[PDB]
Amino acid sequence: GLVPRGSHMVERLGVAVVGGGFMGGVHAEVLTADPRVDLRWVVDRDERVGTDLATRFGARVTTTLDEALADDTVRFVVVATPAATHEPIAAQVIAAGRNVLVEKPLVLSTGHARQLAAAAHERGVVLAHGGNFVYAPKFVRAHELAADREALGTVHSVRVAFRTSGPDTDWFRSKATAGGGALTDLGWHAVELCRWMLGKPAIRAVTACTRQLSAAGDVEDQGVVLIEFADGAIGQCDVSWACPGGEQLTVEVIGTEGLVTADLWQGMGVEAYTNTKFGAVWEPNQGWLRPEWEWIRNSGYVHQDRQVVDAVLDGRPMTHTPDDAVAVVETLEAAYRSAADGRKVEMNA
Amino acid sequence: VERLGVAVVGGGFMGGVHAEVLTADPRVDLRWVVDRDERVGTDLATRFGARVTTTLDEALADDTVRFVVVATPAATHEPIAAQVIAAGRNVLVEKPLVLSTGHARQLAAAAHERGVVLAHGGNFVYAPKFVRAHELAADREALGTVHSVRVAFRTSGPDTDWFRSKATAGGGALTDLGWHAVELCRWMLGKPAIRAVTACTRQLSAAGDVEDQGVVLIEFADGAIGQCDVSWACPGGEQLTVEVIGTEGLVTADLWQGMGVEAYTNTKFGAVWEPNQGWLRPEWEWIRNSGYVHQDRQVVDAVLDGRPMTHTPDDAVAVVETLEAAYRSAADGRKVEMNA
Amino acid sequence: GLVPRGSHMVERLGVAVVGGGFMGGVHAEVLTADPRVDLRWVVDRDERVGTDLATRFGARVTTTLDEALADDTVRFVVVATPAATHEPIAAQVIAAGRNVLVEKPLVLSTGHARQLAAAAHERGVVLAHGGNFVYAPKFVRAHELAADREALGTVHSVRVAFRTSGPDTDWFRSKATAGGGALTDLGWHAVELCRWMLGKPAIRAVTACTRQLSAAGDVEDQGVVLIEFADGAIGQCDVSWACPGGEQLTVEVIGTEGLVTADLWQGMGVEAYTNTKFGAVWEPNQGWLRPEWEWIRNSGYVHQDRQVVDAVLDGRPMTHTPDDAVAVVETLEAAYRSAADGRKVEMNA
Amino acid sequence: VERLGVAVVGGGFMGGVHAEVLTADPRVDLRWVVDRDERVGTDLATRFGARVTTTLDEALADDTVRFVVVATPAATHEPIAAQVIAAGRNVLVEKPLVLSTGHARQLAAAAHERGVVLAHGGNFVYAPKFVRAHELAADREALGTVHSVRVAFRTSGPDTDWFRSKATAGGGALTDLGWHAVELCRWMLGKPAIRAVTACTRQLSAAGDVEDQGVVLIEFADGAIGQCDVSWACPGGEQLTVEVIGTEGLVTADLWQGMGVEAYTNTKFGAVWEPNQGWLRPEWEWIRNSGYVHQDRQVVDAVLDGRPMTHTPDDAVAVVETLEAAYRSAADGRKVEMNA
Ligand SMILES: NC(=O)c1ccc[n+]([C@@H]2O[C@H](COP(=O)([O-])OP(=O)(O)OC[C@H]3O[C@@H](n4cnc5c(N)ncnc54)[C@H](O)[C@@H]3O)[C@@H](O)[C@H]2O)c1
Ligand SMILES: NC(=O)c1ccc[n+]([C@@H]2O[C@H](COP(=O)([O-])OP(=O)(O)OC[C@H]3O[C@@H](n4cnc5c(N)ncnc54)[C@H](O)[C@@H]3O)[C@@H](O)[C@H]2O)c1
Ligand SMILES: NC(=O)c1ccc[n+]([C@@H]2O[C@H](COP(=O)([O-])OP(=O)(O)OC[C@H]3O[C@@H](n4cnc5c(N)ncnc54)[C@H](O)[C@@H]3O)[C@@H](O)[C@H]2O)c1
Ligand SMILES: NC(=O)c1ccc[n+]([C@@H]2O[C@H](COP(=O)([O-])OP(=O)(O)OC[C@H]3O[C@@H](n4cnc5c(N)ncnc54)[C@H](O)[C@@H]3O)[C@@H](O)[C@H]2O)c1
């Protein structure tokens, strides 16, 4: 083998999805493919958007989180709303005694993260966060090779590059609603991947640089973080919202005896060219392309959500815990401080 | 919730893979392993909690068994499959379905008459990456007129002895690897009829009496040319690539070198298929990525829900004929016309 | 090292170029960069084209081959005219006692090739042919590794693929003027590369398939040749005029212990993307590109012409001789016969 | 036809390369090899038919010598170059030109006053592939606003001992490799001014007292961010890549992994730099492709034909300052502002 045994048709878990936008849709599609899941509610401030998602999966639609929480069959809530709404919404879901999966970034301050985590534990519920790429099949494989100590020797370098042409919806570009720019949006993943590839060691210091390119908004479009891990390995996170030509996500680990690299979007092994356009391909879809296949599964969403559901229904302890989210949140806060005053920031947390 | 009782015949490498794939299906109950070698069958049975026997009829006496996977040497396929169908069971037969076109048509007809599912083990037409490439290649506006398809399949050759005997394998690389190459070529073009086949083969190793490499040029009805390039003599790692070229566009897909992970070591990687020293391109999820999971899900779906199959015994017959024509072409040094 | 010593400024060789089209221009540019070369004449039936090339290099222009041959300073003639004109023109250049470089394909029949070669030898002049890719730096390197017998073991497979979107000028698509289509135009190179990569062994048999896609003309757009070499290795030449997206040229050699591959146009190590267009790039020049650098030198034209000039001026014997051209010509003639009647053709020549 | 008399100082690895490159130039007469080790200098001299000495002044007493290549350890560069310029000779000094910004400005000024050519050994800005990438990256309509440049330069480290001594090398990887990284970054953007530099370094090996790896973030005047990533601790083969990203486009170039030749062997390739087992990506024409040939042709052109140089001592000063600022940043844990 080995093929993981298939879910498991038979338990029933009532689910609410809060935020029926892009990511709420992905989760709705991933969760409804799981035989154990009953999607009961879509919650959204925009009723048209909420309604469109709900009818697609035969859920009920509401604009009030409290209506869904009044449904006793709901035991699990997915929160995919703008970043600054995560903490109030997750705090209320937890207080109502429900399990909750919160999209990246968990919250926007170290305090909120520690306190949300303490509140979930007290309430005896699962708090899970949406760092999907550490569940991506390709990266899991690469993580396994990066852990071969005989093969790599002493690891000294890790690098994660994550580049897009930027967000589609407006809330991403305001601090008030988003917390920060590319460093928050993409840097979340890059920092989680870096830690993880190294075996989650303590971070000793951080250095960072950011720029805002776009006139719209008040957040950065690009950032580079230099992370100093406790063993002395240097991490780099290179993120950007101003990169054309298609999403890029790569991971590189370098030791004294070996190295491991992995490429998500440019490593799918399919190539195409056309003089006109490919209908079934994400724009840009003319000229030379490297088309994706199974983008949802290959980004890790399917494995993440299966393991979250396994944690709620079967008490199967998760690989990635609120401790990991807390570590990411303080790294990002340290990075923003470093960028602001042009100095290395010592960690301690 | 719908349980399906399954028996696996042949407890070797492929029986092992199928057993792994089917027992991951919540609908499936693996009840029997059948194998002529009792030690091999016992090992597989104890691993998956099934009964074991050396006699297929002991497993067919079990009325719970409604579906049988046949993963035995090529020449044993037809007698076994005929038996299974005669006993009213649905069957999946590993590639080379059969060695003769007459036998293929009989089995299909016998299966249709009995009202059972006959399925064949061409797993790579179910591989997720190839399935995506096939979708792109079907965009007529994007590709214009399709005039070339090429499938290269290269390995360092089989390890068990019966593969290199003509009596039991029915062929060498052209059969073992060519089955897939031809099925992929055909499929990438939307499955058009084949009009002619030219082929060249060669035996390299001294062991056995079958070819180690071969090339087939295929003339499809519309005039597009297919190339199938297969070999048991290629070092450095398995290769499987697909290429479709039209006047306005093209599509390529690479299975084993397009998996997007690179590694280097001065020593070795323990978790990697040898060669595991120096520069490597390691696989991940090789069973799923090769198409076995999707194949076996769609065959179980057919048996349970009557949901009609994408790849049919008609496809398998087309492949058998082509391989028959290719071996004749290789012997006669001439293009062979397909009156079928 | 090692860097080849630089030409050698000082000898003077008067040159005529016949055919001032695309390839006559390339040669004019390569030859005038050689300090030893004096480009005296451009000969072309079209005076405007001839004149445009000549003024660019300060040559004289004529429409009569005889005018250039009346110039005693001319000792070396480059023939870059349509394929069917090669034999008469080269026969006249040779008879006038001049050295001659004839573009691919040398001539269109085995007889003509043997007889042209015999005539040059009798006249004591160099006859050279324009198979440039066997001089391409990258392929020379690959040829050297393919000759490591310990590293490859027994070589059993060689493959050359050569694909373009087809010729620009009309004469290429008529048998009368061109001899044949892609199999002649591209197959010339593919067959020469195959032989060479294997150490130029005898060819025992040939099998071939061709199709005509285009309505214009009467020659084939695609062809595949299966070559059986004497040692038992199988060669493949895959050529096409109907391939979009940019020129492709690759070489693959496979043995029992190893393999060697090389990629000319997709192996240049430069990548680019733009949302608009790159001005300095060969169309298609939008979207994802793999731009060439030094395309003339990297295709081998510079090394070929330097070695041809070395042969004339310094008697330095050439690596690739008229014997090699004769072998290619009969392979192609065998291939066309095989395609015509659907049978393997045994060689003997 | 115009002959230029040359002396090479330092008969080691780089002196060897330069001697190879310059003697291929028909305009050049290599007359002297100078080296403190007589055996090393003698070996190089006998190979190229030059005179040999251990005393630079014996070679400067020769009035035929109009041009000197200095390929000695970093700390020896300034005293030697000063001597050569003081004697009225044109000079080419290998990378790290000098270790101090003051010294760089003196040499440039001394050279300008004497009326001679001072050139520095940044060969990769002359590499044909990078020169092409630089042309693409200069297409403003195609790239839009340029906001990122990244240069990664990775090796398994130097083999001679003086490289790992601060006294004689003036630095580790950040100096040895970083010189190129910074010069490439700067050049790819059209050579704008540098406003600030942040850096992090680390020593891995126990031997020596210099860093093995370092990263530099560079803030250019317009606001574009440069990254220079260098390391002596990277296995599997040398890497050198360049990346430029703008809002409308991007350009990347790969020197050692973008050479387009792939090989595999179960044994080894004799004609290949080790690692020469397993999967390889072999180099071809490494001297020319690294830029040495073009560099040395353009320096000889300058000396003979007064044809002004693309890369000037002003560029070298900019690089020296940046490296100075980077090492301070690495020590202080802070961004260093460039008031130059
Ligand atoms: N892990 C990933 O790969 C990934 C990818 C994209 C986005 N995200 C994250 O998911 C979350 C949502 O992102 P998105 O792309 O789906 O945004 P989106 O703008 O597409 O959707 C946001 C939705 O939330 C609704 N909404 C706003 N406030 C609400 C509220 N108080 N209550 C209920 N609904 C509300 C909005 O009407 C909208 O429908 C973000 O936190 C984002 O960072 C994660
Ligand atoms: N689709 C694929 O990717 C793929 C890959 C490998 C093999 N196959 C095919 O699967 C089939 C088996 O190949 P394999 O690699 O597993 O071979 P194998 O030698 O590993 O196993 C074959 C097993 O069948 C047993 N056996 C032999 N004759 C039998 C008989 N009459 N009745 C019952 N059992 C018998 C043998 O003891 C043996 O254990 C072949 O047809 C092969 O072509 C397909
Ligand atoms: N080795 C290579 O890489 C390569 C590439 C392209 C073409 N070629 C070959 O070079 C030759 C010319 O090809 P091209 O692309 O330059 O064609 P072209 O059509 O661009 O140029 C042909 C030129 O020859 C002129 N011409 C025709 N008949 C003439 C005659 N009797 N006397 C003098 N001039 C005459 C024409 O006016 C025209 O200027 C062909 O044989 C071709 O196969 C080789
Ligand atoms: N541009 C490049 O790609 C590149 C590559 C390697 C080295 N370099 C540089 O070239 C220079 C030499 O490096 P190397 O690898 O050739 O070192 P090396 O140790 O191989 O050779 C240095 C030589 O200089 C001799 N020498 C030492 N002190 C001397 C002195 N005072 N006077 C005369 N000779 C003296 C030594 O005997 C030695 O033979 C260094 O500055 C290095 O940074 C540049």
UniProtKB/TrEMBL annotation, chains A, C:
Q: Which InterPro entries match?
A: Gfo/Idh/MocA-like_OxRdtase_N, Gfo/Idh/MocA_oxidrdct_glycsds, GFO_IDH_MocA-like_dom, NAD(P)-bd_dom_sf
GO MF term (any one): nucleotide binding
**Lineage: superkingdom:** Bacteria
Q: Domain GFO/IDH/MocA-like oxidoreductase: where?
A: 148-259
What organism is the protein native to? Micromonospora echinospora (Micromonospora purpurea)
Residue sites binding NAD(+) per the record: 22-23, 44, 103-104, 132, 169, 171, 301
- Pinpoint the Gfo/Idh/MocA-like oxidoreductase N-terminal domain residues: 14-128
Keyword Nucleotide-binding found: yes
Keywords, alphabetical: Nucleotide-binding, Oxidoreductase
The entry's protein name is: Putative NAD dependent dehydrogenase
